[PDB]
Design a protein around this ligand. Structure first.
Ligand SMILES: O=C(O)Cc1cccc([N+](=O)[O-])c1
Ligand code: NI
Ligand code: NI
Length: 257
């Protein structure tokens, strides 16, 4: 019964999941000066025109916007990836304050939040099987800074009062995740892991260099969510980020010079 506190937070997870101290854990600090430009990288293809959003769920640690992943409707290809990766969900990690919240850091800089678009490799047939493989997932990570509002985020922000507490869901159809992407698809990539239990080492991370801007008011609404279930004492859903982990024997590659 894990979480983000003093008593059950990241620094405890290893007792249940020894993989927490593994060789390819995420997130990491991205040292921009030491990431090497890789000309082998094929260009990134994000194909979200046919996406079908279904539902938004407060899972007790974040909220997930879930997609129909029963066909190739929203897919990621190219970049560092071999093959086709299907969008299953996106979620965010965020802070109690604007000065923290991202999982990845960039030269030790923390952003206010980070958006994760989670995709699984179709060669494995479903998500559950994909997470058992070293190349099972591709997560597109996008930093959020506080400034101007992000218009394409507002639909997400407005429904959050309907999923305040753990286990609540709401219909969330017709949402276009294209409206959450920055202009540039320049990226860093490295092999890593999920950042909550069970911490599986199944992720090719693709972290975009260009952040999106969201308003103060938008992020404030994320911080009104609750970790707890309805009828339990209120614990605001904030600081649901794992800190940077050791890079170990990995290289971070850049798609750009
Ligand atoms: O890495 C995370 O944010 C945690 C996590 C936990 C469980 C599933 C996830 N997913 O990527 O579908 C992600
Ligand atoms: Ni538990
Ligand atoms: Ni995540």
């Amino acid at each position: 019964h894990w979480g983000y506190g003093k008593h059950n937070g990241p620094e405890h997870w290893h007792k249940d999941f020894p993989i927490a101290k593994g060789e390819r854990q995420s997130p990491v600090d991205i040292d921009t000066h030491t990431a090497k430009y890789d000309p082998s990288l094929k260009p990134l293809s994000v194909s979200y025109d046919q996406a079908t959003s279904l539902r938004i769920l407060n899972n007790g640690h974040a909220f997930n916007v879930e997609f129909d992943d029963s066909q190739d409707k929203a897919v990621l290809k190219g970049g560092p990836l071999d093959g086709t990766y299907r969008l299953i969900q996106f979620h965010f990690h965020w802070g109690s304050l604007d000065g923290q919240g991202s999982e990845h850091t960039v030269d030790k800089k923390k952003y206010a939040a980070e958006l994760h678009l989670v995709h699984w490799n179709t060669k494995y047939g479903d998500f559950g099987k994909a997470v058992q493989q070293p190349d099972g997932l591709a997560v597109l990570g996008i930093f959020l800074k506080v400034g101007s509002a992000k218009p394409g985020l507002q639909k997400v922000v407005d429904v959050l009062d309907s999923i305040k507490t753990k286990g609540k869901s709401a219909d969330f159809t017709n949402f276009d995740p294209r409206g959450l992407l920055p202009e540039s698809l320049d990226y860093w990539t490295y092999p890593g892991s999920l950042t909550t239990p069970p911490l599986l080492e199944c992720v090719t991370w693709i972290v975009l260099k260009e952040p999106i801007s969201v308003s103060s008011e938008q992020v404030l609404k994320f911080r009104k969510l609750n970790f707890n279930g309805e009828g339990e004492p209120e614990e605001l859903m904030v600081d649901n980020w794992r800190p940077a982990q050791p890079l170990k024997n990995r290289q971070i590659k850049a798609s750009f010079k």
